[PDB]
Design a binder for this molecule. Structure first.
Ligand SMILES: Nc1nc2c(-c3c(Cl)cc4c(N5C[C@H]6CC[C@@H](C5)N6)nc(OC[C@@]56CCCN5C[C@H](F)C6)nc4c3F)ccc(F)c2s1
Ligand SMILES: Nc1nc2c(ncn2[C@@H]2O[C@H](COP(=O)(O)OP(=O)(O)O)[C@@H](O)[C@H]2O)c(=O)[nH]1
Ligand SMILES: [Mg+2]
Length: 170
């Protein structure tokens, strides 16, 4: 039987969470996917010889901290924390997203990858060095992506799968 991985994509509105998820599932860039739709998407992919069923939650909508929302987010096994390289605020919000994940998982060691999206744009405001220094302080990988060109998309999701797999085999 295939191994199921529950991945959750988090980050500020408009950073490219939906475009990244759709690039992984469908291999095409979808410009302007409904900013309000939160949904889960499935992809069967073989990673390092293992047949994986990736169940990916693309977050959207209201910020809320109910017992239900916490319980739901806690089911995630690994998290992509996404910011956009042309939106400093989205990068500044990363500490918040990481803290919410650590809080509901009750752990300092949650599989996580920091993703700096929209690297195809020339309007960079978040330096690569500042972002990689933050990932280094967290002990997690940092991958720059472009959902528009597909650059780094497989690397970001498959690195997260490998982090979850490593966590389960400890
Ligand atoms: N209950 C649990 N939730 C979570 C979350 C979670 C989710 Cl799912 C949504 C939002 C969210 N939304 C989802 C998408 C993107 C933006 C918008 C609202 N639409 N927004 C904010 O923060 C937004 C800001 C601005 C206003 C005040 N906040 C604090 C900072 F200033 C940043 N955090 C969110 C968040 F952390 C993540 C991981 C977990 F494990 C848990 S557990
Ligand atoms: N140039 C560029 N635009 C992108 C990229 N990813 C997403 N976008 C655009 O940025 C906007 C927000 O993307 P979206 O996927 O809806 O982000 P979400 O709100 O995090 O789900 C849309 O206009 C997307 O088409 C990317 O890598 N490069
Ligand atoms: Mg979206």
């Amino acid at each position: 039987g295939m191994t199921e991985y529950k991945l959750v994509v988090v980050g500020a509105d408009g950073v490219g969470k939906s475009a990244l998820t759709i690039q992984l599932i469908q291999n095409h860039f979808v410009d302007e996917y409904d900013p309000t739709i939160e949904d889960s998407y499935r992809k069967q992919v073989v990673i390092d010889g293992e047949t994986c069923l990736l169940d990916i939650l693309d977050t959207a909508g209201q910020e809320e901290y109910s017992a239900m929302r916490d319980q739901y987010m806690r089911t995630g096994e690994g998290f992509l924390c996404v910011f956009a390289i042309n939106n400093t605020k989205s990068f500044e919000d990363i500490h918040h997203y990481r803290e919410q994940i650590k809080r509901v998982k009750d752990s300092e060691d949650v599989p996580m990858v920091l993703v700096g999206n929209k690297c195809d744009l020339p309007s960079r405001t978040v330096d690569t060095k500042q972002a990689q220094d933050l990932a280094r302080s967290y002990g997690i990988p940092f991958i720059e992506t472009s959902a528009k060109t597909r650059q780094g998309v497989d690397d970001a999701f498959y690195t997260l799968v490998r982090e979850i797999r490593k966590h389960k085999e400890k």
